[PDB]
Every structure is written in C-alpha cells, then in structure tokens.
C-alpha cells in the first residue's frame, strides 16, 4: 500500500504522470530500462509518420487508437509497464502527452542520481588545469554531495571569468560583469563626494 517516494514534487495532470511513472518503475527497479524506452517512442514519433498521425489526428475513433498501440506493442523486449502506459494514453487520447512526460521523467531520473546540469561560458577554452580549478568553486555552489556535468562554452563578450548557468542559479565571476559593477561603484561615490 506504499509507493516509493518521489524525489521532488511537480505540477499536475501532465507531469505527475511522470511522477507516478517514477513511483511505479522504481518499485519494479526498471529505471534506466524504461527511460530510454520513452526515447524510442520519440524517435518513433520523429521518423515514422503513421504513428505520429495517431497522436494528433482528431478523426480517428477511440478503438483504432488502442487497437494499433496494443497491436504495435507486442512483447518485442518492451516492458509491460511501458506497454500499459502507452495503452493508457491512447485510451484517452493522451498520445500528445509524451514530450512532456519524458523531460520531467528525465528531470526526476536526474533527481534520483543527484546529478545537476550546468553551462560554463568563458572567453578562453578550458585546459586540463583550468577546468579542474573551476569545479572547486562550482561545488561550493551545489548544496550537497551532488554530481556535476560539464557543458563548456565560448563567447567573446565575457572578458575571462565564468557564469555557472545552473538553470536554477547563476554565479557571475566574469570580469565583464566586474568592470561593470566597478563602474557603478565609481559613480555612486564620485557623485556623493
């Protein structure tokens, strides 16, 4: 009667599908099994046209929607957690709800691994010492014993330094911001003096 606890809460009626999906698959310990199975359906929704007609056509009746999905979903290695899921979305026309339920299941899976994104922008590419001096200030800016990925990036307008685009937080140690804030502390003291 107990479900495995969701690592972070979400919004409703389109993303808590993924919260419920994570609460089912982690009970079956099928976590990285079914997550890239959602990816294949997106490639099925990308390349093939007959399946992606079924996710947006408003004229197909409510029995051809389920009798193609359960016809396509034989065993084939596919999980019955996944097979009972994709039956349910074509049961109530929710086959358009796939591209949202994945990216929050992506978020919830990266919430199960303690594994946060970032994107660091410099003016200079990072060598094998410059990148390993970066993380020791970056891991002051995560809250706990988390992981860290790297998405190194080049832009000329920053004059050295970095900006850690956590997508939730940002730390500006770039000098182009520093010379801007140096100029604002010039003007706030030359006008007052």
């Amino acid at each position: 009667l107990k479900l495995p606890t969701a690592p972070l809460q979400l919004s409703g009626t389109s993303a808590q599908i993924a919260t419920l999906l994570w609460q089912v698959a982690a009970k079956e310990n099928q976590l990285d099994k079914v997550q890239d199975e959602l990816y294949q359906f997106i490639e099925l929704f990308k390349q093939h046209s007959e399946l992606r007609r079924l996710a947006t056509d408003p004229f197909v009746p409510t029995l051809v929607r389920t009798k193609i999905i359960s016809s396509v979903l034989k065993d084939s290695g596919a999980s019955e957690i996944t097979k009972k899921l994709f039956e349910a979305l074509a049961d109530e026309g929710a086959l358009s709800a796939l591209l949202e339920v994945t990216v929050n299941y992506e978020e919830l899976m990266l919430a199960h691994k303690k594994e946060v994104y970032c994107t660091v922008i410099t003016a200079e590419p990072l060598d094998k010492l410059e990148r390993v001096e970066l993380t020791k200030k970056a891991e002051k800016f995560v809250d706990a014993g988390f992981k860290l990925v790297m998405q190194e990036k080049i832009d000329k307008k920053l004059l050295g330094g970095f900006v850690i685009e956590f997508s939730d937080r940002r730390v500006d140690m770039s000098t182009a911001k520093k010379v801007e804030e140096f100029n604002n502390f010039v003007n706030k003291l030359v006008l007052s003096i």
């Binding site: 957690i81 009972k84 049961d91 109530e92 358009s96």
Partner: peptide, 29 residues
C-alpha cells in the same frame, strides 16, 4: 519537422492522472 505538433500536452479529461494510474499499477507484479 515531425514533432512540432507534439510540443505540448493536449487532452480532454482533466482527471487524466487518475485514469492512467489504474492502467499503470496492473503490470506491477
């Protein structure tokens, strides 16, 4: 190209999560 119509959720039946939950727990062994 072929995923611009899939970019957002769209459905009827605002109580959809309660519908799918009874169709996700059966395959729980």
């Amino acid at each position: 190209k072929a995923l611009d119509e899939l970019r957002k959720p769209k459905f009827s039946s605002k109580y959809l999560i309660q519908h799918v939950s009874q169709k996700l727990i059966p395959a729980v062994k």
